RNA sequence: GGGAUGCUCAGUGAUCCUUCGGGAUAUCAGGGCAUCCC
């Protein structure tokens, strides 16, 4: 059982039927992943949604000028049973720069030019082009 | 009992950095407390 996998595929499924908005269960890593794909313009927005029980994540997703979809593809990469874990010189290009790769680091979760940046590794949590 | 979350602790077990002395703590795995679900 993956939450993470589970988030990316609502967003490709919702991406499809070219839908305005979709939701998934907040966590604090999905927070980090969707305000990620917002600062990387991806995404139009993410919200909270308050529900008592452990939240919502409310994702508006973004399509251009002739109803171009912004986003093409989001790969799940590390998993529940395979992590996948890149030293600084090894985390991945999506594209040759054209796509991104979320890293989870301990400075938290950025891209993969972030990651070369402040020269760390961490784990390869997802590709998104 | 099993899931899913949050606050927190520690840190080498995983992982990352390193001038090899050490250092980081997002995630995985630990400790404590707490909420929601079957």
């Known amino acids: 059982t993956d ?3 589970d988030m990316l595929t ?7 039927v ?3 908005k979709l939701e998934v269960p907040a966590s604090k890593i ?4 969707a305000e990620l ?3 990387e313009g ?5 919200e909270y949604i ?3 029980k452990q939240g919502i994540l409310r994702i508006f997703l973004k399509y251009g000028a002739n109803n171009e979809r912004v986003i093409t593809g989001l790969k799940r990469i ?3 049973g395979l992590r996948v874990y890149a030293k600084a010189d090894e985390v991945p290009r999506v594209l040759n720069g054209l796509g991104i790769a979320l890293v989870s680091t301990s400075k938290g979760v950025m891209t993969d030019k972030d990651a070369r940046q402040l020269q760390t590794g961490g784990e390869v949590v997802a590709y998104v082009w």
Do not use: G, Q, T, Y
């Open 10 to 16: 609502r967003i490709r499924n919702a991406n499809m």
């Open 42 to 46: 991806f995404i139009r927005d993410v």
């Open 37 to 39: 794909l917002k600062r």
């Open 78 to 80: 590390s998993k529940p």
């Open 3 to 5: 939450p993470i996998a």
């Open 18 to 20: 070219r839908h305005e």
């Open 50 to 52: 308050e529900d008592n």
């Open 30 to 33: 999905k927070k980090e992943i």
